[PDB]
Amino acid sequence: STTGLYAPVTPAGRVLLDRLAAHLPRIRSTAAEHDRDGTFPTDTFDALRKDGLMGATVPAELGGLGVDRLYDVAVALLAVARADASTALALHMQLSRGLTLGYEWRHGDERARTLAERILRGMVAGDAVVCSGIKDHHTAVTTLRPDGAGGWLLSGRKTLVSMAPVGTHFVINARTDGGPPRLASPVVTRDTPGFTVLDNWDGLGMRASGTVDIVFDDCPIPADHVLMRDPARNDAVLAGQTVSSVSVLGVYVGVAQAAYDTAVAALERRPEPPQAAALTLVAEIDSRLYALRATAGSALTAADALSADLSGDMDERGRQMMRHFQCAKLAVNRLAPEIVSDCLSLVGGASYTAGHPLARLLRDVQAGRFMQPYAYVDAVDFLSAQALGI
Template sequence: MTPVDPAPAPPPGTDPRTPPSAAAGARPATPEELLPDELLAAFRERAAGYDRENRFFDEDFADLVRIGYPLMLVPREHGGLGFGLQQAAAAQRRLAAAAPATALGINMHHVLVGVGHTLRLRGDARAGGIFEAAAAGEIFAFGISEAGNDAVLFDAQTVAAPDPDGYRVTGTKIFTSLSPVWTRLIVHARDDTDPEAPLVFGFVHRDEPGIEVLDDWDTMGMRASQSRTTVLSAVRLPADRVLTRTPAGPNPDPVVWGIFGCFELLLAAVYTGIADRAVELAAETARTRRSRAGNGPYSDDADIRWQIAEAAILRDGVELQLRQLTADVDALGSADAPDHGPRWFLHFSGVKHRATGTARRVVDLAMRASGGAQYSRGRELERLYRDVLAGIYHPSDSESVHAAVAKALLGPVGG
């Protein structure tokens, strides 16, 4: 295997390692200020081309870096925008309504900065290193998923071999979003020399020897995310880049808790953004299409009105759940912090499960309400229909969600 070079340079005129003007001067205070309508229009216009050409969202990425988007969850004292998780989810929802694959790709960076956010709320000093790296322009990616590992975060096939300086990590990670540009990859791997806490979580750097990023992303949807396979061959993971060690299986370790929670909630935000756009497109189409039989716009047709209303009702239910649970996370460490206890994990996975399932149903209703023209390649709803299907495959999948809830209610099988 041939080691990869450091992440390719961004488009001319940008440098992700240079703190953006947003960090140095006036900083946007809301998702709407950070992502104005005219910028979202540019993202939406590019999305079709990225999908058609199966290429990374280079221009979108340059714009996101320019406005300080990777620094949303970095506190202001560290040079960031100081958003909470609720604001970050709202911004991701807004971005996903314009460019779902762009939102899904950058989501993985926000998950790791979000871990820093939750650690900071708990008073955990490990947050500082994450914020410092993000403020310096490092781009985080998610190296957790492995083919055949249905335990996902709670076990690993990748091996962490002890080394005098820390570990050497060997294994294959799949669905590594931001593959063309990431500089820091969170990985988990097993060190079975410690049976009490065999799982090692830490960051590998892109410029370390032994990293190969395959050019193997050619999927039905979410094509611009370029979530390629990453092969690790005895890659150095020094002790000072290890975030935590944990037992296998679900556990309340703050790093694992933060990864799980931020991943599920921000993912739910992306798919809720797709639902937002599907409802909007369905309404726009109904107002412009005319019925020959009804001699008027389809917006007057009772069946069409019911389908679009049903889509909006479904979307609204997930929106309220997402707002509440992100607010609950933002309240960590305060007098208002809720005590969900072990149900935190069920809440996180439940919202993700409902958001992705609801988004698929909403897009389906929008397609039904908008006529056969939307089935043609190049139509925005046709692309959303393909993009939204990716929600089936993100952890936690429906099987694991139902198994976890059943265990909470009924106890373990045979117990």
């Protein structure tokens, strides 16, 4: 199978999915409690760490499983999400960081490569859990200031940092302010002075994903723990943002799958044969889920092809990767919640009590809409700009 995210397409992808199977039963078992209490499943992550799955996307050269297709990462996230979407969303941050650090390792200058290499062997060993602090909190602009002696001091606050509760290393999007301002990616470790992880995530869904705020109060960062980016429009950069986020589409596809599976099981348990409207819903969902899978799957296949090809116009490459990502994302964010919603009509009133799985899937399935890049309102400006050559 090379379509619909039905199966991994490479040998490493298969091993990844086989190894994950052992962990599914714990993931499913504790999901309801962590959602109710809003707490991160630290024990699931301890098991994945010692089992080496936290290094799944580290290059085999460095001792990792060598998963290097986005498509296979999404197939694994989908399987995890059918068990618990919060765990999948947190796992995606680790897996996709494996992929972009792997590219720094192979194409960065010596500073990037050395640093990337250290983190990547960390990930395999179980010692490095890598979170991404991307979006500034509204009270703050996260800035790096020279320390006077050749290093830096980082101040600010980032929001919505998933997996933060077990994070050991945090890649932070910041700008300088000591040249003219440049974008920089300092890496802060958890024991850096001035560094606090807050405990303030209270989600409608993704309740267990640890999607908290992190605060930097003059955190000393040494020069070789900073990847300087640039200044300045640069489309080629869209490619890294795609690699960073596109596989997360597997999460919302798995949520829709688990809703459908729940609804069908419910219908089969009944003495009465399904009513006319239930048969029609089932057929409509079956086809919508197919179109959901085919759309995520194809944009993932296309993204993997463009990702592997470095031989051309890098700006065109980044626009094309982002256009595949965004076209598919908008479709996913409309289809997945529609499917989940229609599933509640099949099960009926039992799905409206707080503990039923569908009631949680209805909350978790909404989270994709708000994840940048891009939320709906911004996606429409991006897409119409690209389509009309603005």
